[PDB]
């Protein structure tokens, strides 16, 4: 269920490559869905934020 | 949409990633909202989440979420469960601590969802609780009665010569002689020895001044 440190970090680095310079937003999305392992669901959740 | 909980938690998150306080101008560089849009969110969320000061507008993050003070807690209990000493950079702890070191455990995640705070990491939550939860402050001197009286107390005194009600946000009495000033030289020394730097104490002071109104 809950992600491992290496899984979270791999997902973080991948999300940061797409959403450059959005470190706080990438982490905010990773903390809101800590069980999610899908890069595409995590990317669509980030894109839903109007800020 | 100034009332959205997602945008409020994201502001709390940025403020706590930068020490619990930021100038409005510096906060704007990190969130895609115009100045009036950000101002509307801060205003409608109010002083229970954001304390705004005209120092040059400055913003201090706060919360009503509290940590459980029980030495042994028997569930149910709807507070956060975490090691207090660990957050102050002073837990000696194989880990034989009887208090949770997993800041974002399943139990704590649920409490964070109730306070609309899911999205904060363990470092940002520590900064937030340190300036909002009075459980993180050092002990108050019980023999301290007020200013210009009793030679301070019976005693340097290792405890705070501050109003207890002021720190807990409930000093609703007009005849209070006890100090509400945390930026005093002696208070800062006691706060520092217990893990609270003067920037954190100034955040606490502003939050407590906000509760006093
Ligand atoms: Zn930042
Ligand atoms: Zn408890
Ligand atoms: Zn501990
Ligand atoms: Zn004393
Ligand atoms: Zn008082």
Author numbering:
A (entry chain B): 669 to 719
B (entry chain A): 0 to 54, 61 to 98, 103 to 164, 167 to 224
Lines from the paper:
ZAP is an antiviral protein that binds to and depletes viral RNA, which is often distinguished from vertebrate host RNA by its elevated CpG content. Of the multiple ZAP cofactors that have been reported, tripartite motif protein 25 (TRIM25) and the KH-like and NYN domain-containing protein (KHNYN) appear especially important for antiviral activity. The ZAP N-terminal RNA binding domain constitutes a minimal core that is essential for antiviral complex activity, and we present a crystal structure of this domain that reveals contacts with the functionally required KHNYN C-terminal domain. We show that KHNYN is an active nuclease that acts in a partly redundant manner with its homolog N4BP1.
We expressed and purified recombinant forms of ZAP-X and the KHNYN CTD and used size-exclusion chromatography (SEC) to test whether the CTD interacts with ZAP-X. Mixing CTD and ZAP-X resulted in a shift in the SEC elution profile relative to either protein alone, indicating a species of higher molecular mass than either CTD or ZAP-X. To determine the molecular details of this interaction, we solved a 2.30-Å crystal structure of ZAP-X bound to KHNYNCTD. Moreover, ZAP-X interacts with a CTD surface opposite the linkage to the NYN domain. Additionally, a hydrophobic patch on KHNYNCTD, including Phe696 and Phe719, binds in a hydrophobic groove on ZAP-X lined by residues Val6, Phe9, Ile30, and Leu32 (Interface 2). Phe655 of KHNYNCTD occupies a hydrophobic pocket of ZAP-X, packed against Gly128. The ZAP-X/KHNYNCTD structure revealed a zinc-binding site formed by the two proteins, with the zinc atom coordinated by ZAP-X Glu29 and His17, KHNYNCTD His692, and a water molecule (Interface 3). The presence of zinc in this site was confirmed by zinc anomalous scattering. In our crystal structure, the KHNYNCTD has the traditional three-helix bundle structure of other CUE ubiquitin binding domains but the previous KHNYNCTD structure has helices of different connectivity, spatial arrangement, and length. Three single amino acid substitutions, at Lys12, His17, and Gly128, reduced or eliminated TRIM25-independent antiviral activity. All variants tested were expressed at similar levels. These results suggest that the KHNYN:ZAP interface observed in the crystal structure contributes to the antiviral activity of ZAP and KHNYN but is likely one of several redundant intermolecular interactions.
